[PDB]
RNA sequence: GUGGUAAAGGAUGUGGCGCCGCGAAGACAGCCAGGAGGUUGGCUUAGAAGCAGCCAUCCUUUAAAGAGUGCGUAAUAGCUC
C-alpha cells in the first residue's frame, strides 16, 4: 500500500494531534527522521495493512519508501493512535510477523467446540522480497484437547522461523455452558 | 369441476390404520365415512408396500377427502438401507449410520413423480441433503469432475 | 489466593496501566470510569454471558480481585475493620480491557457484553478487534 | 416524498382567495376559512394552488406539508364535500331522525338525542345506519366520533356503534 | 423556564462531522399479483404439521418466496413481511 507523508520539526505534538495529523518517525540502521501523516488515511490503510503487509510512504521529495510498522503507541481511554514508528526496509533479511489462515474447521468445533487461535501471526526472519500474504494451516484433525505448535507448519519456500519451534500456534478449547454452573453451584 | 373446504395433512401406513388419534380428531369431529372412503383408500395402498405415506388430504365441501398418495417422508428413505426406525437425536456430534449416495439414487426414483423436481441429478441431493439434518453423511465418486 | 492480611485503600490516579488491547477472543468489553469491581460483579457478568448463549464459545477475564475490602460491624472506632464483607475487589481504570469473548457471532457477543455492561458500576464500551496489535 | 411541494388541483369552479395568515375557499356547497402560518407562501396559480416554505429547517417542512394538506382538504371540502358513515350493531339497537336531530336506542335507560352543528347534516337510511355529511372535514370527523362515543364497540360482542368498514376484533369469554 | 442547579439507563429531540449499504439499469415508502412443492425438517414429546425446546448448513417450478419474522390454533389453515 501507499500513503502520503510529510516532514516534521519542532511543532507541538499535541497541536499536531489536534490537527488530526498523526506524528511518526521513519528510520532504519541508516536513516532517522521526524515525520507525520494524516489520521483518516492511516486508518483506512492500517485496517488492511497492519505490520504484515508492507507499505510505501510518499514524500514531497518524490521519494517512495519501503516502510514497515514496528510499533504504534496507543492513548488510553477509548483506543486511539498516538505515534507511529516506521522501519524503512532495505534488502537484507529482517524480522517481522506474517499472518495466518486456519483453513478447514477442526473436529472439535463440529462436535461443539471453540477455536482458541493463540497466534494470529508468526514472527519469521525473511528477505524484503519474500512477503507471503498468508500461510495456510491444514488444521482439521484437531479435537477439543489437541493443539498446533510451531513445529508442524506450512514453512514457506526459503523462509525460516525466528520464534521457538515448540511455541504453540493454536489450540482448541471446550465450550462452557449453563450445565457447568450446576457443578459450580456445588463445589 | 371439484369442491374443497379444508386441506389437511395426515400420516398413516399404506394398508394398516385405525380411527385413533391424531387421525381421529382429524376426521372424527369433521365427520368421515369409512365405508366407501377407505374402500378407495385401501385400493391405492393394496399393491404398494408398507410405509408412512403422507397422503395429502384436502377435505371437500361435501365432507369427502382427496386420497392422492404422495411419496413417503424424507426421513423414510434414508433409514431404509440402514434398517433404522428413526435417526440421530443430535445430528452434529452424533451419527446413527452413514449410507453411501448409491442407496440414495435409486430410492429417490420413488420420490419424484409427486415431486416437481425434474431430474434425478437434482433429486438425489434432496435425499442426501435432508439426511445431514437427520444424522447421516455420504460418500460418492463422480461429483464435480470439471476439466 | 494467599498473601497476608488486609490492605490500604489508595486513590486511583489517571488510567495509566488501566488501559490495554484485545489479546484473546474477538470482541471485548472496556471501561470508561475508575472503579472497584467486587468479586461478586465479575461472576454476575460471567454467569449473565453464559446464561445468554448456552454452550457458547469461551469467556475471558483479564482482570482479577486481590484488593481486600474492609468493613466495620456498624460501631465506633477500634482499630481497622476486619472486613471482607464484600471480600475482594479489582481496581479498574478507564480503558482497561475487561471481558473477552470468542466463537460467537456479532449479535451474540454484542448482546452478551451489553448485558454484562449493566451488571457493572461503570459506563462500559464494546470494542471490535480493529488491527492495532503489538 | 414531499406532500407540500405537490400542487393542489382546483376543480372548476371554486374561487380561492389568499389573505395575511388566512385563505378563503369558496365553493358550490359553502365557504371555508383556513388558518395559514404567516411564514408560508400561498400561491394562487391558474387552476392550482401551491405552497412554498421559507426554508428547509424542520419546523418549516412540518408546516409546509400540514399547510398543503389543510388547504387541499378545504378545496375538496367545498366542492365534493365530506361524509362518513356509521354502522349500528345490536339487538335492541336502532336509530331514527327527528327534525334535524338524531335519536339513538343504544340500550341505555333513555333514548339519546344529538343535535347537528352549523354546516352539518344527519342522515338516517336504514334504521341501523347513520350517514354524517358536511363541508368541513374535521368537523364531520369530530361529529361522527362524538356520535360513536355514545356507545363504543364491545370488546366481547358485536354490540355498539362502528365506523364504516371498521374491523371487528373480539375477545373470548368463558 | 433548560439556564434556575442530581446519576445509572432510555428516545424518529435539534444542529454538526464521517464511514458503510441501496438508487436514474428506476430504488425506500404506500399501492395491484404470488407468498408455494417432497416438507408435516431430524429428534424429543399426550398434541410439535413454517411456529415450547435440543440440533443445525438440501433442492427445484420460477421474474419470486429466507428447510422459515411474529401473531393465531390442541395440532391446522390464516394475516403478512
Ligand atoms: Mg516476544
Ligand atoms: Mg484457585
Ligand atoms: Mg485518601
Ligand atoms: Mg459513641
Ligand atoms: Mg450501566
Ligand atoms: Mg326501558
Ligand atoms: Mg443518559
CATH number at residue B3: 3.30.1550.10
Distance between CA atoms of residues B53 and B72, nearest Å: 4
Exposure of D157 in the CB half-sphere (CA atoms within 13 A): 8
Helices B74-82, B120-130: axis angle to 10 degrees equals: 80
Cα B112 to Cα B78, B107, D31, distances in angstroms: 15, 10, 72
Q: Does A112 touch chain B (CB under 8 A)?
A: yes
Helix (H) or strand (E) holding A38: strand A32-38
CA of C69 to the centre of ligand 2 (A): 19
DSSP β-ladder status, A94-101 and A135-136: parallel
CA atoms of A21 and B127, how far apart (whole Å)? 61
Distance CA C29, CA C100 (A): 6
Half-sphere exposure of residue C83: CA atoms within 13 angstroms, side-chain side = 18
Domain that holds residue B91: 71-139
Q: Using CA atoms, how far apart are residues A5 and C105, in angstroms rounded to an integer?
A: 38
Angstrom distance (rounded) from CA B64 to CA B1: 15
Task: Please report all neighbours of A, defined by 3+ CB atom pairs within 8 A.
Answer: B, C
| Nearest one of A120, A102, A104, A4 to A52, comparing CA atoms | A120
DSSP state of A75: E
Beta strands at A21-27 and A80-87: parallel, antiparallel or unpaired: parallel
**B68 grid coordinates:** 392422492
Instruction: Give the single-character DSSP code of A72.
Output: E
Residues of C in contact with A120 (CB under 8 A): 133
Number of CB atoms found within 10 A of residue A117's CB: 19
Residue B42 lies in a domain: yes
- CA–CA gap between residue A137 and residue A148 (Å, rounded): 9
On whether both B119 and B59 belong to a single domain, the answer is no
Please count the structural domains in chain B. Answer: 2
Chain C residues touching A173 at Cβ < 8 A: 58
For residue B43, being part of any structural domain is answered with: yes
Specify whether B59 is located in the same domain as B16: yes
**Residues B23 and B80 both lie in one domain:** no
Does residue B47 lie in a domain region?
A: yes
The minimal CB distance from C55 to the residues A47, A74, A175 is found for: A175
Tell me how far apart the alpha carbons of residues D67 and D53 are, in angstroms, rounded to a whole number: 10
Helix and strand numbers, DSSP H then E, in chain A:
4, 13
> Within chain A, where are the H helices?
13-18, 39-46, 107-110, 178-186
Q: Which of B46, B70, B94 is the last residue of a domain?
A: B70
Q: Measuring CA to CA, how many Å separate A124 from each of A19, A97, A150, B129, C23?
A: 37, 6, 11, 44, 20
What distance in Å separates the CA atoms of residue A60 and residue A8, rounded to the nearest whole number?
A: 12
B78: the nucleotide nearest its CA (via C1') is E42
Q: What is the rounded distance in angstroms from the CA atom of residue B127 to the CA atom of residue B130? A: 6
Can you tell me the distance from the alpha carbon of D35 to that of C19, in angstroms, rounded to the nearest whole number?
61
Q: Three-state secondary structure along chain B?
A: CCCCCEEEECCCCCCCCCCCCCHHHHHCCCCCCCCCCHHHHCCCCCCCCCCCCCCEEEECCCCCCCCCCCCCCHHHHHHHHHCCCCCCCCCCCCCCCCCCHHHHHHHHHHCCCCCCCCCHHHHHHHHHHHHHHCCCCCCCCCCCCCC
Quick one: cell of C113?
A: 457484553
CA distance C108 to C101: 10
Residue B16 lies in a domain: yes
Q: Are residues B127 and B80 in the same domain?
A: yes
The verdict on residue B146 lying in a domain is no
* Residue D32 in grid coordinates: 371555508
Q: What resolution does the deposited structure have, in angstroms?
A: 3.6
**Rounded distance from Cα C122 to ligand 5 centre (Å):** 6
**R_g (Cα) of chain A, nearest Å:** 21
Cα D65–Cα D68–Cα D71 angle in degrees, nearest 5: 145
Nucleotide nearest to D59 (CA to C1'): E14
Cβ A185 vs Cβ A166: under 8 Å:
no
**Solved how?**
X-ray
- Alpha-carbon span B105 to B112, nearest angstrom: 11
Gap between the Cα atoms of A5 and A34, Å rounded: 11
Cβ-contact D40, D53 below 8 angstroms: yes
**Separation CA D89–CA A46 (nearest Å):** 71
Q: How far apart are CA A5 and CA A61, in angstroms?
A: 10
Contact C65/C87 with Cβ under 8 angstroms?
yes
Looking at CA atoms only, how far is residue B91 from chain A in angstroms? 10
CB atoms within 10 A of CB D72: 19
Using N-to-C axis directions, what is the helix angle for D137-148 and D58-79, rounded to 10°? 80
Q: Could you tell me whether strands D48-52 and D8-9 are parallel, antiparallel, or unpaired per DSSP bridges?
A: antiparallel
Same domain, B65 and B99: no
Instruction: Enter the C-alpha cell of residue D118.
Output: 352549523
- CATH number, domain with residue B108: 1.10.10.250
Domain-located, residue B144? no
> What's the CA gap between C52 and C100, in Å, rounded?
15
- How do strand D101-104 and strand C58-59 relate by DSSP bridges? unpaired
The string of DSSP codes covering chain C is ----S--------SSSSS-----SSSSEEEESS-EEEEHHHHHHHHHHHHHHSTT-SEE-------EE-----S---SSS----SS-EEEEE-TT-EEEEEESS-HHHHHHHHHHHHHTSSS-EEEE---S---
- Map residue A125 onto helix, strand or coil: strand
Angle between helices C39-52 and A178-186 (to 10 degrees): 140
- Cell 339487538 -> residue: D91
Q: How far apart are the first and last CA of chain C?
A: 31
d(CA B42, CA B67): 10
* Residue tagged 465450550 (cell numbers): A175
- Residues ≥6 apart with Cβ < 8 Å to B3: B60, B61, B62
- Minimal CA–CA distance to A19: which of A8, A30, A28? A8
Alpha carbon distance C115, D156 (integer Å)? 41
Start-to-end CA distance of chain D, whole Å, equals 49
Handedness of CA C101, C105, C108, C109 (dihedral sign): positive
CA distances, A33 to each of A85, A88, A113, C20 (Å): 10, 11, 49, 28
Give the domain-ending residue among B12, B44, B70. Answer: B70
Q: Could you tell me if B125 and B109 lie in one domain?
A: yes
Residue C67 and residue C1 in contact, taking contact as beta carbons nearer than 8 Å: no
Sign of CA dihedral D41, D42, D44, D50: positive
Q: Is the preceding omega at residue D9 within 30 degrees of 0, hence cis? A: no
Handedness of CA C11, C16, C17, C22 (dihedral sign): positive
Query: For residues C82 and C75, what is the distance between their CA atoms, to the nearest angstrom?
Result: 13
- What is d(CA A34, CA A26) in angstroms, rounded to the nearest whole number? 7
Touch between D and C (at least 3 CB pairs under 8 Å) = no
Cα A82 vs. chain centroid, distance in angstroms? 17
Residues 28-87 of B with CB under 7 A from strand E: 29, 54-56, 70-75, 79, 86-87
C125 touches chain A (CB under 8 A): yes
DSSP state of A40: H
Q: Are C63 and C42 in contact (CB under 8 A)?
A: yes
- Classify each residue of D10-41 as buried b or exposed e, where b means 16 or more C-beta atoms within 10 Å of its C-beta: beeebebeeeeeebebebebeebebebeeebe
Q: Is the dihedral of CA C114, C116, C122, C127 positive or negative?
A: negative
Same domain, yes or no, for B96 and B49? Answer: no
- Domain check: are B79 and B111 in the same one? yes
Domain co-membership, B135 together with B77: yes
**B147 assigned to some structural domain:** no
* Judgement on whether residues B56 and B79 belong to the same structural domain of the protein: no
**CA-to-CA separations, D49 to D15, D74, D138, in angstroms, rounded:** 11, 12, 21
Q: Name the nearest CA neighbour of C124 among C52, C58, C28, C50.
A: C28
The whole-angstrom separation of Cα A98 and Cα A109 is: 25
Find, among A75, A23, A22, A83, the residue nearest to C16 by Cα.
A75
Residues D130 and D118: beta-carbon distance below 8 Å: no
Task: Give one DSSP letter per residue of chain D, joined into a string.
Answer: --STTSPEE--TT--EEEETTEEEEEETTEEEEEE--TTSEEEEETTEEEEE-S-SSHHHHHHHHHHHHHHHHHHHHHHT-EEEEEEEE-SS--EEEETTEEEE--SSSS-EEE---TTEEEE-SSTTEEEEEES-HHHHHHHHHHHHGGGPPPSSSS-EEEETT---------
Q: Of B25, B43, B70, which one is at a domain's C-terminal end?
A: B70
Within this chain, do residues B78 and B123 fall inside the same structural domain, yes or no? yes
Give the integer Cα–Cα distance in Å for C130 and C93. 21
Residues near D163 by beta carbon (within 8 Å), at least 6 away in sequence: D84, D86, D87, D144, D148
> Considering only CA atoms, which of D131, D138, D171 is closest in space to residue D153?
D171
The torsion region of residue C85 among left (phi > 0), alpha (psi -120 to 50) and beta comes to alpha
N-to-C CA span, chain B: 53
DSSP structural state of residue A10: S
Q: Which of A35, A30, A45, A32 is nearest to A6 (CA)?
A: A35
Q: How far is the CA of C9 from the C1' of E40 (A)?
A: 67
- Which residue, among D161, D166, D144, D65, has the nearest Cα to D104 in the 3D structure? D161
Residue C108 CB neighbour total at 10 angstroms = 17
- Quote the CA–CA distance of A153 and D58 in Å, as a whole number: 62
Beta-carbon contacts of A119 under 8 Å, excluding residues fewer than 6 positions away, are A100, A167, A168, A169, A170
CA distance C58 to C42: 15
Crossing angle (nearest 10°) for helices C106-118 and C39-52: 150
Has residue B145 been placed in a domain?
no
- CA distance to A185, A186, C48, C60, per residue, from C87 (Å): 18, 20, 21, 21
Residues B77 and B54 in one domain: no
Report, in ranges, which bases of strand E sit under 7 Å from a protein C-beta.
8-9, 13-15, 27-28, 37-44, 46-49, 54-61, 67, 73-77
CA D156/CA D153 separation, integer angstroms: 9
Tell me if residue A45 falls in helix, strand or coil.
helix
Other CB atoms within 10 A of residue D98 CB = 11
Name the DSSP class of A57: E
**Residue found by looking up cell 373470548 in the block:** D172
Distance from the Cα of residue D31 to its chain's centroid: 15
Amino acid at each position: 500500500y501507499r500513503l502520503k507523508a510529510y516532514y516534521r520539526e519542532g511543532e507541538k505534538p499535541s497541536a499536531l494531534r489536534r490537527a488530526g495529523k498523526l506524528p511518526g518517525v521513519m528510520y532504519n540502521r541508516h536513516l532517522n527522521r521526524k515525520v507525520y501523516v494524516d489520521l483518516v488515511e492511516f486508518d483506512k490503510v492500517f485496517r488492511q495493512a497492519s505490520i504484515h503487509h508492507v507499505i510505501v510512504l510518499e514524500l514531497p521529495d518524490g521519494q517512495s519508501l519501503p516502510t514497515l510498522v514496528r510499533q504504534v503507541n496507543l492513548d488510553k481511554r477509548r483506543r486511539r493512535p498516538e505515534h507511529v514508528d516506521f522501519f524503512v526496509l532495505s534488502d537484507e533479511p529482517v524480522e517481522m510477523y506474517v499472518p495466518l489462515r486456519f483453513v478447514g474447521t477442526p473436529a472439535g468445533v463440529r462436535a461443539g467446540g471453540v477455536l482458541q487461535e493463540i497466534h494470529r501471526d508468526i514472527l519469521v526472519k525473511v528477505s524484503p522480497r519474500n512477503i507471503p500474504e498468508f500461510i495456510e494451516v491444514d488444521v482439521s484433525g484437531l479435537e477439543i484437547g489437541d493443539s498446533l505448535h510451531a513445529s508442524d507448519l506450512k514453512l514457506p519456500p526459503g523462509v525460516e522461523l525466528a520464534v521457538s519451534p515448540e511455541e504453540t500456534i493454536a489450540a482448541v478449547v471446550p465450550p462452557e455452558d449453563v450445565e457447568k454452573l450446576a457443578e459450580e453451584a456445588a463445589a | 369441476m371439484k369442491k374443497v373446504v379444508a386441506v389437511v395433512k395426515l400420516q398413516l401406513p399404506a394398508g394398516k390404520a385405525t380411527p385413533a388419534p391424531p387421525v381421529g380428531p382429524a376426521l372424527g369431529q369433521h365427520g368421515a365415512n369409512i365405508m366407501e372412503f377407505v374402500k378407495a383408500f385401501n385400493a391405492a395402498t393394496a399393491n404398494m408396500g408398507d410405509a408412512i405415506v403422507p397422503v395429502e388430504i384436502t377435505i371437500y365441501a361435501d365432507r369427502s377427502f382427496t386420497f392422492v398418495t404422495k411419496t413417503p417422508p424424507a426421513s423414510y428413505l434414508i433409514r431404509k438401507a440402514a434398517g433404522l426406525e428413526k435417526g440421530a437425536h443430535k445430528p452434529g456430534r452424533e451419527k446413527v449410520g452413514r449410507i453411501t449416495w448409491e442407496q440414495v439414487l435409486e430410492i429417490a426414483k420413488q420420490k419424484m413423480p409427486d415431486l416437481n423436481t425434474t431430474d434425478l441429478e437434482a433429486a438425489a441431493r434432496m435425499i442426501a441433503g435432508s439426511a445431514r439434518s437427520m444424522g447421516v453423511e455420504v460418500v460418492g465418486a463422480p461429483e464435480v469432475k470439471d476439466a | 489466593r494467599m498473601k497476608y492480611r488486609k490492605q490500604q485503600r489508595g486513590r486511583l490516579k489517571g488510567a495509566t496501566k488501566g488501559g490495554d488491547y484485545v489479546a484473546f477472543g474477538d470482541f471485548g468489553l472496556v471501561a470508561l470510569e475508575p472503579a472497584w469491581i467486587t468479586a461478586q460483579q465479575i461472576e454476575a457478568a460471567r454467569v449473565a454471558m453464559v446464561r445468554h448463549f448456552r454452550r457458547g464459545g469461551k469467556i475471558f477475564i483479564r482482570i482479577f480481585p486481590d484488593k481486600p475490602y474492609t468493613k466495620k460491624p456498624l460501631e465506633v472506632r477500634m482499630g481497622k475493620g476486619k472486613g471482607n464483607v464484600e471480600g475482594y475487589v479489582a481496581v479498574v481504570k478507564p480503558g482497561r480491557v475487561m471481558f473477552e469473548v470468542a466463537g460467537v457471532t456479532e449479535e451474540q457477543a454484542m448482546e452478551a457484553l451489553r448485558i454484562a455492561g449493566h451488571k457493572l458500576p461503570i459506563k462500559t464500551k464494546i470494542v471490535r478487534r480493529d488491527a492495532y496489535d503489538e | 416524498s414531499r406532500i407540500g411541494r405537490l400542487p393542489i388541483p382546483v376543480p372548476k369552479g371554486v374561487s380561492v382567495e389568499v389573505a395575511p395568515g388566512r385563505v378563503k375557499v369558496k365553493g358550490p356547497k359553502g365557504e371555508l376559512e383556513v388558518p395559514v402560518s404567516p411564514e408560508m407562501r400561498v400561491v394562487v396559480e391558474e387552476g392550482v394552488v401551491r405552497v412554498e416554505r421559507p426554508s428547509d429547517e424542520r419546523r418549516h417542512k412540518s408546516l409546509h406539508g400540514l399547510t398543503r394538506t389543510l388547504i387541499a382538504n378545504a378545496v375538496k371540502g367545498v366542492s365534493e364535500g365530506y361524509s362518513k358513515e356509521l354502522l349500528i350493531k345490536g339487538i335492541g339497537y336502532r336509530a331514527r331522525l327527528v327534525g334535524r336531530a338524531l335519536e339513538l336506542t343504544v340500550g341505555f335507560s333513555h333514548p339519546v338525542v344529538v343535535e347537528p352543528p352549523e354546516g352539518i347534516t344527519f342522515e338516517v337510511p336504514e334504521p341501523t345506519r347513520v350517514r354524517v355529511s358536511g363541508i368541513d372535514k374535521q368537523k364531520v370527523g369530530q361529529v361522527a366520533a362524538n356520535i360513536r362515543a355514545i356507545r363504543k364497540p364491545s370488546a366481547y360482542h358485536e354490540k355498539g356503534i362502528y365506523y364504516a368498514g371498521e374491523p371487528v376484533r373480539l375477545k373470548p369469554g368463558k
